[PDB]
């Protein structure tokens, strides 16, 4: 009955704010009741505050004051949640949802698609790249693996492509480690061929879109 | 917040019945407020599950059904599928703290393909990562099943904690799981000893790779 879209990922220092929108579309948003609920890696939920559109009022969660700031456009239908003076623990995915009309707690029957925001004291770095070259040790019967160290940038995403994109089968790519020095690392892997080692080239394309960089590493043999 | 509790993980294969609890206090379950469940697939938003402790809004399977009694909720599922492997929230209203209040999550795995050996491949910091001053030895740990491991590293078969970094496992794109190890080291670390390990536990079975700076 609602489809609500929130806006795109976030990546803030410590003490800035953030602005997250939820555009509804369907229903009659003006009329229903609209919360915002976090969620931090791995953890369970958290609720930020409402908003009551149909009298202007707006009800933040006790453990964010001044800090939450909850917002409606009437006209084109978008609400809004601001989170100021932002610390490292409000990294989370944050939800719009709605309940339904009234000033009672009702359920959550619709939710926005999340808008992941990453606070950190750390700024923009590119990967370094560095083969996982293939050898005996990677070497079993008919397959061996071989592959790219991701190392130290921030923030995520990032992407490998193997030979442009051409090399699909075979390839994972793992999740990242997040390190003390708040700079994040993951590999890629791809099992090809144990006899196609030494004749046939695999470069590992890493792409950096938040630092605007690519790297392409050729990755060879002993 | 998360003051409702329920198990941290559920376990069945497929065509079992399973049940969530839901425990909360007199402040919430407890003063006769309602309570919710949502359910979240891996990467995606919460949709609500049951509503009205009981109630399944339209295109919620039969399988589900909740209810509640004096401070506990319970959810059901009453027949597995591979797709119910997600996270359970309850949720309800606490007039102590004047707000919503959720439940701690519970994870339900559904065992729905057999027991798979995990593939092991240690490598070696590259001459490159020397030349940097650096040095990162990687383990990588691959289509295994179910999804739990425990790594463990090593300088000539005496263990190390400091310098090591691992991610939870997750799904592959055949439904296996896979999961990296990381061992930081100085240059200096890694040419003093004769040899580093990499040890893989999964289901009772123990794999250990070396690598040797020689």
């Known amino acids: 009955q609602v489809q609500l879209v929130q806006s795109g990922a976030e990546v803030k220092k410590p003490g800035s704010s953030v602005k997250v929108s939820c555009k509804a579309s369907?229903?009659?948003?003006?009329?229903?009741?609209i919360s915002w609920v976090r969620q931090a890696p791995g953890q369970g939920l958290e609720w930020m505050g409402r908003?009551?559109?149909?009298?202007?009022?707006?009800n933040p969660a006790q453990k964010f004051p001044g800090r939450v700031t909850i917002n409606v456009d009437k006209s084109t239908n978008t609400a809004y949640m601001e989170l100021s003076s932002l610390r490292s623990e409000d990294t989370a995915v944050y939800y719009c949802?709605?309940?339904?009309?009234?000033?009672?707690?009702?359920?959550?029957?619709?939710w926005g698609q999340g808008t992941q925001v990453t606070v950190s004291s750390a700024s923009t770095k590119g990967p370094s790249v560095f083969p996982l070259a293939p050898s005996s040790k990677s070497t079993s019967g008919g397959t061996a693996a071989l592959g790219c160290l991701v190392k130290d940038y921030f923030p995520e995403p990032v992407t490998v492509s193997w030979n442009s994109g051409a090399l699909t089968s075979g390839v994972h790519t793992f999740p990242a480690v997040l390190q003390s020095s708040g700079l994040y690392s993951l590999s890629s892997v791809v099992t090809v061929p144990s006899s196609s080692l030494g004749t046939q080239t695999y470069i590992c394309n890493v792409n950096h879109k938040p630092s605007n960089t690519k790297v392409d590493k050729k990755v060879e043999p002993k | 917040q998360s003051v409702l509790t329920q198990p941290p993980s559920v376990s069945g294969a497929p065509g079992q019945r399973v049940t969530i609890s839901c425990t909360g206090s007199?402040?919430?379950?407890?003063?006769?407020?309602?309570v919710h469940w949502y359910q979240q697939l891996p990467g995606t938003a919460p949709k609500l599950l049951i509503y009205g402790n009981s109630n399944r809004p339209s295109g919620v399977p039969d399988r589900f059904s909740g209810s509640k009694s004096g401070t506990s909720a319970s959810l059901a599922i009453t027949g597995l599928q591979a797709e119910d492997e997600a996270d359970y929230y309850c949720q309800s209203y606490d007039s102590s703290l004047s707000g919503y209040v959720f439940g701690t999550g519970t994870k339900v795995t559904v065992l729905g393909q057999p027991k798979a050996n995990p593939t092991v491949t240690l490598f070696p910091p590259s001459s490159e990562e020397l030349q940097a001053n650096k040095a990162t030895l990687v383990c990588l740990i691959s289509d295994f099943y179910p999804g739990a491991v425990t790594v463990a590293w090593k300088a000539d078969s005496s263990p190390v904690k400091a310098g090591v970094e691992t991610t939870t496992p997750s799904k592959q794109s055949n439904n296996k799981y896979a999961a990296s190890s990381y061992l930081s080291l100085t240059p200096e670390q890694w040419k003093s000893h004769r040899s580093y390990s990499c040890q893989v536990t999964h289901e009772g079975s123990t794999v250990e790779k070396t690598v040797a700076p020689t």
């Open positions: 949802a709605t309940s339904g009309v009234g000033l009672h707690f009702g359920y959550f029957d619709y």
């Open positions: 007199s402040s919430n379950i407890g003063a006769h407020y309602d």
């Open positions: 369907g229903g009659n948003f003006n009329t229903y009741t």
């Open positions: 908003i009551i559109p149909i009298f202007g009022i707006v």
